[PDB]
Every structure is written in C-alpha cells, then in structure tokens.
C-alpha cells in the first residue's frame, strides 16, 4: 500500500524448505566474485569492487544506491558474493555427521556397505525420515566387520576394510585396518577424498543414507566456496560517533581470505611439507571461527585488546540473540511508559494519560465524510498542542511534518488521506506491566487525557496487576488501525478481563479505603 509501485503481486511465504547450499547455486546467487581481503579501494570512499565491501554487493549510505538492484537502503535488499576456497574444508556442525557418513560407505567405491538386500537395511530405508534411515544404516553397518566386497555376489564394493574414523583435531583420521591387526594407517582425511566418495554415492545410496537428490547433499556438506555477505549485514559500525570500527565479520572475513591466499601461495612456492599443514590449519580454524570462534579446547580468536572475537553461531543462540532478541522480542512505536497514580474518581476502564503521552502518541484516522470537519479542526489546531495533527498522510503515501511545516493548518484533507490525530480521551490502548504472568496483566484501558505525567488509574484495577504507586513504570500502546481498535474494544478490554479463568473467579474487588468504608 504505502510502498512504491511494484508489478510483483502481493503474496506471503507459505512454506520454508531447509537444506544445504550447492557451490554452483552459491555462484548462482553470488552477485560478484570476492577475492580481495582489502576493503577500502583507495581509502578515499568507494570501497573495493570485488572486495568484502564491494558496492556492487550493496550500498550503505543514504544517497548511494546498490549497483546490483539500483536502490539504496530504501529498497536495497542485500546481495551476496562468493569466495572460492583454495581447498575444500569442513563445516563445524557436520564433523560428527562426517564421521556418521564415514561409518556407512566405502572409502574407495563410495557406496553403502549393504543395499536393500538384507531385511534390516531395507526396512530401515522404508523409513520416511532421512536421519533415522541413515542412522539405522549406521546401526547395521556396525554389524559388519568389513566393508563387504560381497554379501556378508559383489555389490560393486571396494572391499577395503572400513577405517576407524575419529574426529582427530579439526579434521578426521581413519585407522585403516588393512591386510592379527595390520599397521594402523590413520591419516588426514583430505576433503578431496570425501568429495570423491560422495560423488561415487548413487542417488539411491544418498537417498538411503537419508538425503534428497534435488536438495541438501553430502557433497554440499563439504565447503568449497564461502558466502560473502552484503555490506548491509556488517556495515561500518561507529566505534566513535563518526569514526567507524570495522565490523567483526569484516575482520574475520579478511583473516580467512588472507589465509586462503596463503594457501593459494603454498603451491607455486617451496613448501617443505609441514608449512602446508600449518597454513591449512590456520585457514581451517579461521573458517571455523567464521561459523564458530567458540571451538572447544581452543584459545578462541581474540582481539589484540584481549577480548575474544565473535561468530555467527553466537548471535543465533542465547537469551536475546537474533530469534530471542530481535524476532520474538522487538521494540514498538506508539508506546509509552510512565508512572502510575491513583484516581478514585476515575472509571475502571480508563487510565489518566498525561497530555505529553496523549499528544506524542497518535492514531492515523482516515479522512472520511463524517470526520472531515473535526479532522480539519485538528489539523488547523496545531502540531504542538492537543488535539492536533503532527503529520498528515497522503492517500498515495506522502507525509507533511506539521511542526516544520510553516503552513501547518493549510493541509486540506482528501477523503482517503490519513491524519495522525493526537490520542484523544476514551482512546482504547493496550496496558502492560512487567512482569505479566496472567493474561489479565494485558488490559485495554481508555485514555483519559488529563494533566500530570503519571498514569491515573482506579484502585480496583491495580489489584489484578498486584502493583502499587511506589514508582512503578507502566506501559501504554496506541492502536494504529481500525482493526486494532475493534480488537482492543472486543477482546482485550478491562471489563473483558474481570474474571480469571484460573480459579474461574473474578480478578478484582473492593480494596483499601473503599473496603474499610463499606465496612
């Protein structure tokens, strides 16, 4: 409605399908190749194209527009890049699953130790769930001493004995028990070998190893390219007002990419064996810190100041992370919080609202044939008093800053325009106290615009809140649409919360002065 015109039809998301990301699709979304750790092209604005802060990846300021989509923050949706790893690596949350998939198939032929031939494996594969069928595949693979070249009749297997797989450091090691026990040849399981065996896996095999052919792949489970976020995600964050400290994500991406270029340099130069090992492990725990700097048993990547460096894993799990602190809990507008006071002469379903709250907080009333007179009165009255418009919203979307508008009262209202009418008396508002245990702690009170900067209430309505006027802060929320006002009046009102469903009894009664008096 208020958005600029877009031919794209108005629709919502009905399903969300999970899974991994293929490197081919990673480029299919990567709007630009990123290989340069260095971000600011010449330290004179216009950051490095093809770098971590590529403007092509997006714009960051008010006037600049994203070179990809053509719009700035106003419409810039963020665009992604790709950085090709010099060598395939492991995903921090899949090493146990690397061990899992290495406990099921051949190290050379890359196929399941069995098929649906045995009844146990077949019935395991009849399970609809991928993870359960694959774990039962493991549970029956452990019933066989060797990677069967035949029936425990060749199944196309390699026949080499399955190595004892262990998460040995960042990577894994497999104790091959070759031709009572041979030399234990546990070795670095280079991700190339794992890619090979995964490619050897038949679609039927990955299906019975609990995977979808069109979707998340054990091949995708091996990282070959990393995603470079849009600069909007890790913007220039002000370390001091204007001076911006580079984002932690930017720091870590730079570290990872410089390690990757070191790895790229490991080939053409003289590399006496262990140098490649050290540089590769360097790059590896840098990437790990990209997912998770909190690797157990390791001194975490830490700032030179001494504080540890963060990761994406941290901001998604916790008490107020992404989900908790920004999605299931986030701030709202047309909301106020102030002192509460007693008003014995006030009605129960009203709160004595300060003129400051009833003025700053407002409702957008659409200009109709019946409210045209009073809405025009409000507009002409002034934005710095009550009642009065402070913004008048055009039906197309245009707004007018009444206070900064030298012709504040000269806004002739069109049927379809919206006027931010200041919160009048008897305006239904959501009423909130912290903590709020019972649903009777959310109550819709009518605003009574009356002086003083407190919330004037009835005594009886305070008892269900179990609060007092020793300085408690109370929360008021102003509806911004007709649906909201109707909902407040018919499903959240003070009179609608009189009876507690808990003890199927009223929540309220006569207390204090009134109770002693009636006695």
């Amino acid at each position: 409605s208020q958005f600029p015109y877009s031919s794209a039809p108005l629709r919502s998301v009905k399903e969300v399908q999970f899974g991994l990301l293929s490197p081919e699709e990673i480029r299919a979304i990567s709007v630009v190749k990123i290989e340069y750790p260095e971000i600011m092209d010449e330290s004179r604005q216009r950051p490095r194209e093809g770098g971590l802060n590529d403007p092509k990846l997006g714009s960051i300021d008010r006037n600049f527009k994203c070179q990809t989509c053509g719009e700035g923050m106003a419409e810039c949706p963020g665009h992604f890049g790709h950085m090709e790893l010099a060598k395939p690596v492991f995903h921090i949350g899949f090493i146990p699953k690397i061990k899992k998939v290495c406990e099921c198939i051949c190290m050379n032929c890359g196929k399941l130790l069995l098929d649906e031939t045995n009844p146990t494996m077949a019935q395991a594969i009849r399970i609809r769930d991928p993870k359960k069928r694959f774990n039962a595949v493991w549970q029956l693979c452990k019933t066989k001493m060797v990677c069967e070249a035949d029936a425990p009749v060749s199944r196309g297997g390699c026949g080499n004995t399955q190595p004892v797989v262990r998460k040995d450091g960042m990577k894994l090691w497999g104790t091959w028990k070759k031709s009572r026990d041979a030399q234990p040849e546990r070795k670095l399981l280079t991700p190339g070998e794992i890619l090979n065996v995964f490619k050897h896996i038949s679609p039927e095999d990955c299906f019975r190893l609990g995977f979808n052919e069109d979707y998340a792949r054990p091949e995708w489970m091996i990282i070959t390219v990393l995603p470079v976020p849009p600069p909007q995600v890790r913007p220039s964050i002000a370390m001091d007002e204007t001076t911006q400290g580079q984002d932690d994500l930017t720091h870590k991406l730079s570290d990872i990419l410089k390690a990757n270029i070191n790895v790229q340099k490991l080939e053409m130069d003289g590399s006496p064996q262990h140098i490649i090992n050290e540089v590769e492990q360097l790059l590896q725990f840098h990437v790990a810190t990209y997912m998770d700097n909190d690797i157990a048993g390791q001194p975490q990547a830490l700032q030179k100041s001494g504080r540890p460096v963060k990761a994406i894993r941290a901001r998604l799990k916790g008490k107020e992370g992404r989900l908790r602190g920004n999605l299931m809990g986030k701030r709202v507008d047309f909301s106020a919080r102030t002192v509460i006071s007693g008003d014995p002469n006030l009605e129960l379903d009203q709160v004595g609202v300060p003129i400051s709250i009833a003025k700053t907080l407002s409702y957008p009333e659409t200009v109709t044939q019946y409210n045209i007179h009073r809405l025009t009165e409000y507009v002409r009255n002034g934005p710095n008093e009550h009642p009065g418009a402070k913004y008048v919203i055009r039906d197309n979307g245009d707004r007018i800053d009444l206070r900064y508008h030298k012709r504040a009262g000269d806004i002739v209202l069109q049927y379809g325009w919206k006027v931010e009418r200041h919160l009048m008396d008897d305006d239904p508002v959501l009423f909130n106290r912290q903590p709020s245990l019972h649903k009777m702690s959310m109550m819709a009170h009518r605003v009574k615009v009356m002086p003083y900067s407190t919330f004037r209430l009835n005594l009886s309505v305070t008892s269900p809140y179990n609060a007092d006027f020793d300085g408690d802060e109370m929360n008021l929320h102003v509806p911004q649409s007709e649906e909201t006002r109707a909902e407040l009046s018919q499903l959240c009102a003070v009179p609608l919360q009189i009876v507690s469903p808990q003890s199927n009894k009223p929540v309220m009664g006569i207390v204090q002065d009134t109770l002693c008096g009636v006695r």
Binding site: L302, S305, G306, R307, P308
Partner: protein
C-alpha cells in the same frame, strides 16, 4: 588488558557524591567475589557470626 579473560571486575569503582553518605558508606564496603557459579544462599544469608 591482554589477559582480559579471567579478570575480576568491580574492585575499583567511581566514588558517588550524590549524598555525603554516598561517599562515607561507599568507603567501607566489603565484597565476596565468588560469583553465581552455583546460586546458594550461604553467601547471601546472614549468619550468627555476622553479629
């Protein structure tokens, strides 16, 4: 500062001069830096020896 981790925080604090006692009493605190690692009431509960 290099060993930012494993460092005790609060042993030195800004002196309060909101009121005169906001200094005097402020100069005669004691603290038990055990931490909420295990909640317990013994670090918080008054004891007869505190008489």
């Amino acid at each position: 500062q290099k060993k930012a981790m494993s460092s005790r925080a609060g042993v030195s604090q800004v002196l309060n001069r909101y009121t005169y006692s906001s200094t005097l009493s402020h100069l005669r605190r004691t603290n038990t830096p055990i931490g909420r690692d295990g909640k317990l009431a013994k670090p918080r509960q008054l004891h007869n020896t505190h008489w």
